[PDB]
């Protein structure tokens, strides 16, 4: 969602100051869930990854 690993952390450390950075937040997690599920489905090993 244009978020890097540092940008994801700063959005977490907000006192619910989420106007529409939630769109960046949920898109970042959506792709992350896709990548993890793809690795699990392929049964890729931790060494290869």
């Amino acid at each position: 969602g244009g978020l890097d690993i540092a940008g994801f952390m700063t959005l977490v450390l907000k006192e619910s100051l989420n106007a529409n950075e939630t769109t960046q937040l949920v898109q970042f997690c959506h792709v992350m869930a896709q990548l993890s599920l793809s690795v699990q489905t392929l049964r890729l090993s931790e060494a290869e990854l």
Partner: protein, 49 residues
């Protein structure tokens, strides 16, 4: 002309060269290089050893 009987039955027994067996598929463990932790300079405690 086509080597058949008067009724149309073929006169030569055919062959097909049976497909070559099932296939074996194996999986293996994969390992990668792994490092260790480092050590920093230590603080001087106020108490004895």
């Amino acid at each position: 002309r086509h080597n058949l009987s008067i009724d149309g039955q073929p006169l030569s027994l055919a062959i097909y060269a049976e497909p070559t067996d099932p296939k074996a598929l194996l999986t293996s463990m994969v390992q990668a290089s792994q490092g260790g932790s480092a050590v920093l300079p230590g603080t001087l405690s106020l108490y004895r050893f």
